[PDB]
Design a protein around this ligand. Structure first.
Ligand code: PLM
Length: 392
């Protein structure tokens, strides 16, 4: 299992087949994206020798999951017959501060959420009663606690999980088809991101997500609650696969979210790249380019299908009164918010105080941006949605 002889996407495949002990796969869709990633980790000089191995190791594990899910479905065709109806899906720009709602929806026992451990070890699926106590989940929690090296180091802002097994993004299902925006944050250039947004056919990916969800439902049934910012970008393919999707559009100051995006990228850049070869001023234009797709893709879809197909969740409303937003979400989704559930939601908020709404200078200077430069990108967006800014 070494990345010395990994030159092509097929080599990555062999390793994944080696590790998982499986060799059959559902299609060829995974190859195009993985080939772009591999070509870059091999050729780009910005990568640390370690960084290269890290990216290839993650790709291998991701592809291995794809292999594991395919073997399972073949042995359990019936899972494909059970529908995934009216999934609750949160989309929009990244850095909108949606974390709270994901956890609150997870408090409803009739609703299912995608937990991070299910994006690491999906097969075999667990029962509802054990979604948070399954040994694979516990093991993940323990080796997470088993990396708390007090070696005078802070950490690495991403202990993905929170409490015992929490909601995660569909991004970690999607990257298994190598058509997910997360891979781009591990790449020095924007070739992969431009391919993804302007060329990649996203159908294979969303079709894969549905199968994935059908496998998790088979042992732990319920109505799905999903999230992933770039669902906004790929909203057309999403609708194709989940035509009945109840879309929750998450909003927040676009200027703030943009600078926050650029900042978010620093962590993966520092984990696998020689940061001195990077230009943070150039990261600003990429973030700007990416944000444009995050607002226009869904804006066009909304113009076509109607505002009523969406629920608008504002960051400022989520801070001042989340419980109010929940009741309105439930009314809108026309579903009863039981007292038991409302209590769990309140109990969660009590134990998880949220950062008060505050206004500070965004300052995209650090990334070569200005509100004046971003204004045209979000002009329509800010004009159609009443967003409370956190500027100056
Ligand atoms: C817009 C993000 C949608 C997916 C949400 C799960 C995490 C994906 C990556 C988060 C950063 C999104 C912005 C682009 C980052 C990149 O270029 O990789």
């Amino acid at each position: 299992s070494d990345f010395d002889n990994i030159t092509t996407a097929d080599d990555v495949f062999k390793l994944a087949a080696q590790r998982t002990g499986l060799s059959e796969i559902d299609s060829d869709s995974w190859r195009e994206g993985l080939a772009l990633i591999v070509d870059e980790v091999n050729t780009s000089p910005v990568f640390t020798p370690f960084g290269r191995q890290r990216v290839l190791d993650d790709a291998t594990n991701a592809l291995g999951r794809r292999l594991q899910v395919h073997a399972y479905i073949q042995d359990h065709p019936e899972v494909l017959d059970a529908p995934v109806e009216r999934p609750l899906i949160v989309l929009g720009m990244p850095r909108t501060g949606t974390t709270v709602i994901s956890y609150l929806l997870d408090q409803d026992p009739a609703r299912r959420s995608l937990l991070h451990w299910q994006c690491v070890h999906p097969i075999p699926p667990a029962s509802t009663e054990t979604l948070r106590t399954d040994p694979r989940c516990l093991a993940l929690l323990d080796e997470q606690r088993k990396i708390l090296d007090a070696v005078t180091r802070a950490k690495m802002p991403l202990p993905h999980w929170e409490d015992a097994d929490g909601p995660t993004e569909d991004m970690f299902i999607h990257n298994q088809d190598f058509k997910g925006l997360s891979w781009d944050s591990f790449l020095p250039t924007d070739r992969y991101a431009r391919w993804l947004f302007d060329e990649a056919d996203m159908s294979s990916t969303y079709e894969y997500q549905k199968r994935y969800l059908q496998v998790l439902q088979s042992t732990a049934p319920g109505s799905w609650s999903l999230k992933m910012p770039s669902h906004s970008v790929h909203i057309e393919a999403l609708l194709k696969v989940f035509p009945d999707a109840r879309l929750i559009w998450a909003h927040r100051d676009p200027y703030k979210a943009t600078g926050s995006l650029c900042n978010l990228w620093r962590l993966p850049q520092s984990l696998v790249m020689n940061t001195e070869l990077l230009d943070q001023t150039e990261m600003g234009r990429l973030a700007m380019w990416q944000m444009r797709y995050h607002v226009d893709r869904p804006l066009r879809a909304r113009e076509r299908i109607g505002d009523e197909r969406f629920f608008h969740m504002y960051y400022h409303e989520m801070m001042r009164d989340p419980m109010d937003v929940m009741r309105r979400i439930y009314e809108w989704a026309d579903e009863p918010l039981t007292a038991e559930t409302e209590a769990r939601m309140r109990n969660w908020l009590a134990h998880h105080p949220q950062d008060r709404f505050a206004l500070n200078a965004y300052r995209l200077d650090e990334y070569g941006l200005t509100v004046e430069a971003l204004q045209p990108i979000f002009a329509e967006y800010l004009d159609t949605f009443d967003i409370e800014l956190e500027g100056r």
